[PDB]
Ligand binder design. Structure first.
Ligand SMILES: CC(=O)N[C@H]1[C@@H](OP(=O)(O)OP(=O)(O)OC[C@@H]2O[C@@H](n3ccc(=O)[nH]c3=O)[C@H](O)[C@@H]2O)O[C@H](CO)[C@@H](O)[C@@H]1O
Ligand SMILES: CC(=O)N[C@H]1[C@@H](OP(=O)(O)OP(=O)(O)OC[C@@H]2O[C@@H](n3ccc(=O)[nH]c3=O)[C@H](O)[C@@H]2O)O[C@H](CO)[C@@H](O)[C@@H]1O
Ligand SMILES: O=c1ccn([C@@H]2O[C@H](COP(=O)(O)OP(=O)(O)O)[C@@H](O)[C@H]2O)c(=O)[nH]1
Ligand SMILES: O=c1ccn([C@@H]2O[C@H](COP(=O)(O)OP(=O)(O)O)[C@@H](O)[C@H]2O)c(=O)[nH]1
Lengths: 375, 375
């Protein structure tokens, strides 16, 4: 009943961005369920500031350490050096027994590097996703490869991601298939009774929900996307597009330039994860280049056109929910037009399934970690 | 006859340490033999200052860029941040077509990272060496793994190193077996006519040449080594040991403490590569934890006891020249004592062969690079 604090494994979770925070929040909550076995320490780089805080506030997570590294229009070098120097300091102070990193951000990479530089084991949550193209996604494909060679334990969401690691000669006895913790989060946010102003001003129109921020999509590719979206809106009078625009000033310039003040297109601030998941669940069609949206959509049964030349979510393609659209204006327009015009085409994409698991990934991760240390 | 400078591929070679410099010098020399096809740019981090300059002076190589990063008793984080920031600036200025990195130093890793952060292709000279132990050698095993996932072209010295990359799912069409460039260097330094004071004071004694600097060997392991070496000198009256002591203050403390002022043991400053190769060629036995010495010794037919728990030079073990001794004082003593006492044990290790190639690696590497770019 009382908590004995005297014999605990120090587990440090490290992340710095909105998507990492959403996917790591369930894991933090799960670590906290084992207070006599685990001292759970949360460290954030704050590679993101506002969009990170948005997530921390929903889950009620106060970091033990916060490096506050974000700069305006920061470079990959800014994040790499500020993150590394700060994390090395945190690790020397707290001396964790294992560092847990997530996915494929630059934070993921330098968190892994800092752990290695202190000879601290690394557990890679969301391990083994691949496009095999180091310039798509850039720099995320490289971040998850780099992290891959540093990690001591690999928590693969799916059988294919496990296979990817096996094919790279990782230790088979260090690879575990858990499901994606995205689903752990999703099952607690979605809810039957829900309203939002976006959904108020819709009337009985069909909602197209969009997000766009991939680094390699900046500039020409996003302009192509946005012009296709205006043409869809021109053609389909009963559609409203809602775009919670990423905080990157570059994205915002392009968004404002092409879509600003256009009727039935609503550029809004980033939604918190409860609002976003619930609005997504109630959407007719999503247009996105987001990674997490690709894992969430199948469970919601909501068709998604992926606005990239690659994806590392092949399981959502196989589920029917996801379709790769590329970044060419005419091709995006054509594919989106067919889904908004042809109900049978839409029907093929709207069967709900759970290719990314049952929302119990976090339990499995904590178990694996304890067993690894014989704790 | 005249050199047309107007249509050249910009090739930037990057390195920062003595061993990289020795292994890259032949390559820089060979790139320079193609002045109408290639603009050869040499960039150094000067992770090493004095020991790097010693090499550049022998080969007569004046860097185009010199970051001068070295700090006294620097950390891996020092190298990583100062190296990344400086190389990013050099790459943005020079805009090379390809960056060539060598081996497994921290410079190798952050040179590859800076290229990637500038979407510049990377060619990895000395690609695919593995112990599969990320703490032995530390951090070199991780550096070559990290560099491996970044590299576009892989110049493997040997069939086994190529196989290692193949087993990690590297693109087979980007892996090339060339021989090790260490041999390209060696064939030009060793000479039949040579003297040096170290050799004069030998009389007709047997020379044991030693070097020790591996990061994971600092402290207790080196102390074991050095105590073993004193005992060997005590037992074998006709032996003199020469130790060109690495500039790391930590090594120097241990060296001076245990081996300072001991009769028939000669602690000296680092030898230039001509002096070192020629003194090695004329040694009875080497005791080392150097990587380069392991590649050079077989071609010289000089037995080596490797003072590590691992090696990634298995081909020299197979040649008979190299024997793994570990870092235990009694074991090192025993193995060295047998080689200095038993002529048939020594004979087994002293047959010269060229398991690391024919000293034409650099030619092959430049050929591969030109063909890659259709130049
Ligand atoms: C290499 C890397 O790790 N990129 C990640 C990053 O890209 P993202 O494109 O967000 O890149 P950064 O995290 O560098 O942020 C660029 C930034 O946008 C602005 N900014 C960002 C967040 C914020 O809360 N407030 C703010 O003002 C700042 O000017 C800042 O410099 O986050 C995305 C999630 O959204 C992830 O999908 C990407 O994998
Ligand atoms: C992480 C890494 O890349 N390590 C490489 C480095 O280790 P090495 O042990 O030399 O490590 P560093 O290059 O950081 O050097 C520590 C250093 O030793 C002293 N110093 C070194 C060189 C010099 O010219 N002058 C000088 O004074 C300095 O105080 C300096 O901080 O070089 C070795 C070659 O010798 C390589 O086998 C190692 O792979
Ligand atoms: O306005 C938004 C947009 C997205 N998300 C969520 O943020 C995560 C994805 O983050 P993002 O698209 O920024 O990055 P990526 O997944 O592409 O790394 C997913 O869980 C989304 O459900 C959100 O809560 N509000
Ligand atoms: O005093 C010395 C010691 C070694 N070397 C040469 O330096 C290279 C290897 O450098 P080092 O042992 O410092 O590092 P490592 O090979 O372990 O990376 C080899 O070519 C050696 O022949 C040298 O020229 N002078």
């Amino acid at each position: 009943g009382p908590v004995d604090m005297t014999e605990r494994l120090k587990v440090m979770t490290i992340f710095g961005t909105r998507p990492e925070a959403i996917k790591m929040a369930p894991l933090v909550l799960e670590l906290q369920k084992h207070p006599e076995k685990i001292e759970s320490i949360v460290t954030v780089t704050a590679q993101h500031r506002q969009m990170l805080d948005q997530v921390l506030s929903i889950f009620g997570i106060t970091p033990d350490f916060d490096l506050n590294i974000m700069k305006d229009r920061q470079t990959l070098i800014d994040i790499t050096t500020r993150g590394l120097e700060g994390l090395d300091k945190v690790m020397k102070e707290a001396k964790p027994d294992i560092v847990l990193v997530h996915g494929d951000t630059t934070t993921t990479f330098i968190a892994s590097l800092a752990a290695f530089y202190n000879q601290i084991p690394v557990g890679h949550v969301e391990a083994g996703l691949r496009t095999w193209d180091k310039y798509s996604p850039y720099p995320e494909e490289m971040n998850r490869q780099l992290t891959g060679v540093m990690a001591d334990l690999h928590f693969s969401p799916t059988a294919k991601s496990a296979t990817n690691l096996q094919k790279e000669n990782k230790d088979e006895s260090r690879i575990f298939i858990t499901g994606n913790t995205a689903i752990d989060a999703l099952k607690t946010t979605v809810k039957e009774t829900y309203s939002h102003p976006v959904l108020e001003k819709l009337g009985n129109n069909r909602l197209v929900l969009m997000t766009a921020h991939r680094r390699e999509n900046l500039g020409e590719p996003m302009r192509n996307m946005f012009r296709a979206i205006k043409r869809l809106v021109d053609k389909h009078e009963d559609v409203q597009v809602v775009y919670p625009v990423h905080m990157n000033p570059v994205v915002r310039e392009t968004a404002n330039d092409i879509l600003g003040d256009y009727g039935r297109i609503h550029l809004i601030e980033p939604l918190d994860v409860i609002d976003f998941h619930n609005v997504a669940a109630r959407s007719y069609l999503m247009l996105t280049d987001s990674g997490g949206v690709q894992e969430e959509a199948p469970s919601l049964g909501v068709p998604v056109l992926v606005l990239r030349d690659t994806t590392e979510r092949p399981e959502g393609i196989e589920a029917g929910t996801l379709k790769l659209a590329g970044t060419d204006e005419e091709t995006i327009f054509s594919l989106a037009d067919e889904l908004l015009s042809d109900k049978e085409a839409h029907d093929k994409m709207s069967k709900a399934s759970n290719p990314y698991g049952d929302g119990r990934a976090s339990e499995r991760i904590v178990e694996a970690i304890l067993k690894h240390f014989n704790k």
